[PDB]
Amino acid sequence: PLRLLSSVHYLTGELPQLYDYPDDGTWLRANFISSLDGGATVTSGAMAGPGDRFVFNLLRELADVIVVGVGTVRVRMGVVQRQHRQARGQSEVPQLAIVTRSGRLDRDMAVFTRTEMAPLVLTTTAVADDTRQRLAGLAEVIACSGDDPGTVDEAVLVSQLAARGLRRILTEGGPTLLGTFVERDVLDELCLTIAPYVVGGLARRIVTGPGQVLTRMRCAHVLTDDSGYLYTRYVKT
Amino acid sequence: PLRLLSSVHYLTGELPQLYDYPDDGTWLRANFISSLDGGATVTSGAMAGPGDRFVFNLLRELADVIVVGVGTVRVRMGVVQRQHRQARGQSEVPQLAIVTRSGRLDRDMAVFTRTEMAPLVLTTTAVADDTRQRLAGLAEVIACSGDDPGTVDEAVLVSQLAARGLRRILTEGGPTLLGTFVERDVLDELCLTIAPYVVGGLARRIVTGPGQVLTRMRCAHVLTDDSGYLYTRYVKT
Numbered sequence A, B: 001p002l003r004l005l006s007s008v009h010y011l012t013g014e015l016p017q018l019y020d021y022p023d024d025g026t027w028l029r030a031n032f033i034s035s036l037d038g039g040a041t042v043t044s045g046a047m048a049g050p051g052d053r054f055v056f057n058l059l060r061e062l063a064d065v066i067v068v069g070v071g072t073v074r075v076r077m078g079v080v081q082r083q084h085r086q087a088r089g090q091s092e093v094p095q096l097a098i099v100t101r102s103g104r105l106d107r108d109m110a111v112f113t114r115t116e117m118a119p120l121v122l123t124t125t126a127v128a129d130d131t132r133q134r135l136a137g138l139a140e141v142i143a144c145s146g147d148d149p150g151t152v153d154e155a156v157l158v159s160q161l162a163a164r165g166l167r168r169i170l171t172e173g174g175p176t177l178l179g180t181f182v183e184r185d186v187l188d189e190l191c192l193t194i195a196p197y198v199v200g201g202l203a204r205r206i207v208t209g210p211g212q213v214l215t216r217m218r219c220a221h222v223l224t225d226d227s228g229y230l231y232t233r234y235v236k237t
């Protein structure tokens, strides 16, 4: 009933295929890293070696847009990355989209200053106009409310991105945003690097919040390196 | 730099070898299960299928003693298990050891009633005598203090078990106890079942507490089944 996994193929070229987005339709992929004991932070960078950086950069290269919660904002491509993106018919650098319920973003933000192009600000119908005026010249502000003008509806958010030709979506956090995607069951795929460390009880998980679900996912692949990291890809359902 | 893992060997007999304890010396192994998003509970049973039950029972079968914190106590072997244990020179059923700093255990406890043999109660020098008197007939009470008679020293605990011929140690929790083992760096091995679910932000991790470490571990193996569970074994350092 059990089978041993082992190294069977040196990844030839072949990696982007293992992380391909579907040929059509919207697809929301998350990429996170955690310790063996489920801790997300030490930031997570301390747990991330060269292999994980390689996967991380690849997933950014494949994405139309990278969606990030505003807590975490408090995107570089190199020549080859830009080439590959252009060949596949994408913008040279992926768009950044920042999720905020309050819209309380400052112009003086690091996020607005060191980019090639204006990020998207994804927010509610209720604060969209004022946010649009305050961020004039810096960001495109998009209302992502469903039935309730005072909240962000995750399915609507995803649809708003798709409607702008940004159907291949990547999110890297933070844990609150990811927790809402998981709670609302709009997360299509989780790529998770399992780092070979234990960190003890203090650290938070890769998801936080009040939500509680039991969403079955299918294991699409597990990669590894000599350092004993596991680079996993799981897909609904 | 990356290699693809895949199924290469149907586990013939062969499983206990993959989970062997060292031939001599003390060895503290933990066995836990968690979701992809690092949640330990839904209890953890809801995430545990037949494969995980099989591994769980095997690890109990291999152990000299199972150490559990008192929060979690609020051990069956079948004929074949007993045979195997006897062949390897072990007691027919592994000993249970309950860790308590306060010693505040009641005689009326479920843990004392449905067992073949008296559990060990691992506690402090300061409360050992009174605990010994209250639990007369039900438990052997062992003081596990190091320099401080009011605390449990994890290294001493492990040594007290070893001194009684119980050098092959398994712990299944709870998260506070595991968190102290991790914090004190006395955990030699973690067997971790990664269940193919996300559960959202509410659940706790497999470890809790104030501790914060960065302990590198080596990946000894990863097993899998058709359901997409990963049964991992990591070892210090």
Ligand SMILES: C[C@H]1CNc2nc(N)[nH]c(=O)c2N1
Pocket: A031, A032, A033, A044, A045, A048, A052, A056, A172, A173, A192, A193
């Ligand atoms: C901030 C986090 C976010 N998500 C991640 N995912 C992987 N795989 N590696 C990281 O360093 C990080 N950093």
Ligand SMILES: C[C@H]1CNc2nc(N)[nH]c(=O)c2N1
Pocket: B031, B032, B033, B044, B045, B048, B052, B056, B172, B173, B192, B193
């Ligand atoms: C109570 C927990 C304890 N540790 C475990 N480890 C595995 N692998 N499976 C479980 O159900 C459990 N149950």
